[PDB]
Amino acid sequence: AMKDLKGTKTAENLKQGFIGESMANRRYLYFAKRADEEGYPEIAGLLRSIAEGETAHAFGHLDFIRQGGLTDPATDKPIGTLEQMIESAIAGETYEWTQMYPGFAKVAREEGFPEVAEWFETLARAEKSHAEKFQNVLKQLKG
Amino acid sequence: AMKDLKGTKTAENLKQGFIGESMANRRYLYFAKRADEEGYPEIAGLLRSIAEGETAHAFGHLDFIRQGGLTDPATDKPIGTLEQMIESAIAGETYEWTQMYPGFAKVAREEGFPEVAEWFETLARAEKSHAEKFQNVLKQLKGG
Ligand SMILES: [Cl-]
Ligand SMILES: [Cl-]
Ligand SMILES: [Fe+3]
Ligand SMILES: [Fe+3]
Ligand SMILES: [Fe+3]
Ligand SMILES: [Fe+3]
Ligand SMILES: [O-]
Ligand SMILES: [O-]
């Protein structure tokens, strides 16, 4: 491992860097599909390659987070070992299906956006499925 | 009106949902590499397949964001047209190389983490390159 990063500004900067790099990869792949449709294959290919750069950046942020004794940016749980990684996935998916997406759906219906609410409700069910599958992984790793 | 979401709580929830889904895909692909090394191909395959689910979720959030007249979660810029998408990329990468990563690197050096600082400095130069590449894309879309 490396030097303990707990309590530093650098620890928070690695977290914020990870968030930005994660968004960037998703955004650029989404933009590339628009270039695909419109017939700009060289632009689309460049966007996809830049997206690979943002993957490398996000993974590198996680390397320093992990080696510096810090927790998962998304869940505040340790991600040193594979079992811990799966436990972090479980915690995040559980938050999403028990709290986040059901709340998003309720608000969307209150604000008069039932189609968006249906989407959030679909996702709530999907994250519960994800959580159950990750829990099956953990039981098998621990057995 | 689902086509005008501006100023609503649903607008903020779509943004936060996109952020979480984006992180989830990155996290699960990263975790899959550990399963790969240790010889857990079924676990790695599950992580990768669930990661595809989180991609679909993130992209769907962006669909509703764009259809509702909302802005890019990362830059607060419109992303309706391809040119707007590229202009959002330029703005974000420019912020990253002129301000964010240089500031992160300075803090890392002052806090005694030179390896992290060097990483942030590498990324600052990388985002400058990315910004220039997106700038070229825009020139090409405009006729260049
Ligand atoms: Cl092209
Ligand atoms: Cl396996
Ligand atoms: Fe980057
Ligand atoms: Fe999820
Ligand atoms: Fe999801
Ligand atoms: Fe970037
Ligand atoms: O980035
Ligand atoms: O998710």
From TrEMBL, chain A:
Instruction: List keywords of the entry alphabetically.
Output: Metal-binding, Zinc
Q: Name one GO molecular function term.
A: oxidoreductase activity
Gene3D superfamilies, A to Z: 1.20.1260.10
The residues listed in the UniProt record as binding Fe(3+) 1, with positions renumbered to this chain, are E21, E54, H57, E127
Q: Which InterPro entries match?
A: Ferritin-like (IPR012347), Ferritin-like_diiron (IPR009040), Ferritin-like_SF (IPR009078), Rbr2/Nigerythrin (IPR052753), Rr_diiron-bd_dom (IPR003251)
One Pfam family hit: Rubrerythrin
Q: Where does Mn(2+) 2 bind?
A: E54, E93, E127, H130
* Residue positions binding Fe(3+) 2: E54, E93, E96, E127
Question: Is Nuclease found in the keyword set?
Answer: no
Identification of the protein by name = Sulerythrin
Q: Which organism is it from?
A: Sulfurisphaera tokodaii (strain DSM 16993 / JCM 10545 / NBRC 100140 / 7)
- Underlying gene: ST2370
